[model samples]
Target: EESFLYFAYGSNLLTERIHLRNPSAAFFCVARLQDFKLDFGNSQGKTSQTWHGGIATIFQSPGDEVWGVVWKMNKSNLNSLDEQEGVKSGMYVVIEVKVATQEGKEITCRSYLMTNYESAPPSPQYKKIICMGAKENGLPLEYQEKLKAIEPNDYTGKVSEEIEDIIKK
Candidate 1:
């Protein structure tokens, strides 16, 4: 296939954010991954210097659901996406999940997971980006509130310039 489906529940949920690197990304639909729960954490207990705090990931939890955007992107961008997710460094690993669209259609898409991550709070900026993304993609109202309610760590340091640029724009 010259293209593939990707499930993005984290920063990539924002079109501008995702387009920063993966220009081929195009919104397909919003979907829910049943039996999984959203979480924030540091991979291998190491804080991210980019966001200066934890990042989003997913874990298996029966009866739980994670709502996110499904992006249909050209295969050429797969490597760039994997690199952004730190797949080569083992910070995240690729996984396949079957998500249910609003219409209840099941779709298998590529997602990411951090096997060695531990629970940690995200930074305010990180959380803001997520909330904005949720709002931008029109995620369920309840889900958007859930994202808004996430408490961020008290870190006042500046995030990476790349992220700051996106936030400014």
Candidate 2:
């Protein structure tokens, strides 16, 4: 609840996106949110859920590192984050996880993590869409391929279909 760090690996990678949440929050091209997987924490697809749109998730192995950017913050912002994250009845948990800085520095960061395994499964194709997007848009790829190897036969070769939408958008 004191000062802390928040790690963003998914949609939060986009600064404009996170900035929308904490209007006064500053950013830096620092730390990476390393190794960990995601499980839909609570949202009941048939019931209630927490989504204001543009929310996403990525699963990582127990020891696998998910390199990403970190935000140095305090409880005030985190409480705001918890509010934004919403109730955990069926949404997600902004967990504290271990991560390294972009410069290979180590620090723990907070990111929304899912725990509802019953409703969680990897959208291999969706992941590729993200990976390829990150690549084309210039996101570092050192740990990028990690997603590719995990799920094969994903994307169903509809990569071009995905690309078209992005291109058009």
Candidate 3:
């Protein structure tokens, strides 16, 4: 089993950009980084979670690794991922995180993780996650209706913000 991998479902979906970051990264197909819940806990420190927001991360509370996909990127590509995932200088350094690909393969490798939480604008259409999830990994029926509940977003943000909580350690 491979040691590290990444779980991406947002902009990363745009495989072209991912490839730009890692020319060697091959299309590993859609994969889910499980053991983590979609979190938009701090939409600028607001009480209500942002709607149709975009942010994602697979956090392990009990020191267990989350599951996602692998791109088979080389060291250079990994560097690119680190650069592109710039969170805080020295605070956030990309490291190998465990992930399970959609194919049910477990691999560990260096990936990006935020050292601290930063403020982001609120997302108006928080429901898009259901649609995105459905499109990517077949979302549950309940969630499909939930997505419909959210008003359609004419202008979507960079993220849908359903990837993690603030405490990412």
Candidate 4:
């Protein structure tokens, strides 16, 4: 079909979050990206007003693996995904990655990588979304625990009303 596979290891793992922009996203499977490590940071050192803290990214790190959900989305949503990732602003760079499913089958998917970012902690709300997404998608229990253990910046300021609405649900 005219669709693409997207590996979402961040907040996009949540159906609600992914659907906020890319409505065509549908659950495919749980997969693991090897030789990469997940991180949180602000794009170009500018904290996110939407997330209220740093956002998620991935970097090459041997021996590390990131478990996430695979989403099959219509090709029409490609531009939406790119916009959500702030590709035009250079906040993130789109990349193709081959991830291994639980069944040992490998599939290439679209993912994102952030360069020129300054490492920082995520906000409580942001961390909550990631952890919630991990649990919602049935990612590895160990990975879920790791996500839960991540420290937050404890930002008390208000996040975007859009995110607040989603978090309330």
Tell me each candidate's TM-score: 0.95, 0.59, 0.51, 0.95
For residues 1-169, write the lDDT of model 4, one tens digit per residue. 7999999899998888888777768999999999999989999989887887889998999998899999999898889889878999999999999998889999999999888899999999998888879988899899898899999997978777877877787
lDDT of 2 by residue, 1-169 (tens): 4677777665455444455566555564545554555332124443222221223554667665555566667667767877776534545676777766556766766777554534433344445444554454345676566544644222333334533454345
Least accurate 10 contiguous residues by lDDT in model 3 = 160-169
Runs of candidate 2 exceeding 4 Å displacement: 38-42, 46-55, 58-63, 117-139, 144-169
Model 1 ranges with Cα > 4 A deviation: none
The TM-score of candidate 4 is 0.95
**At residue 121, what lDDT does model 3 achieve?**
28
Query: What do the candidate models score in CA lDDT, each in turn?
Result: 0.90, 0.53, 0.43, 0.89
Off by over 4 Å in 3: 1-9, 20-24, 40-54, 61-67, 87-92, 118-169
Q: Which pairs clash inside model 4?
A: none
Q: Which prediction has more favorable TM-score, 3 or 4?
A: 4
lDDT of 3 by residue, 1-169 (tens): 3322454533354344455445566655444444543332232333332344334433446533233334555544445566666544542445555555445666554555444444342245333333454445443345445344544334444442233221111
Q: Which stretches of candidate 4 lie over 4 Å from their true place?
A: none
**Per-residue lDDT value at 152 in model 1:** 94
Residue 13 CA error for candidate 4 (Å)?
0.9
Please give, for residues 1-169, the per-residue lDDT of candidate 1 as tens digits.
7899999999988988888888778999999988999999999889998888899999999998899999999888888889989999999999999998889999999999999988999999999888889999998889898899998999878677877877787
Candidate 3 displacement at residue 139 in angstroms = 9.0
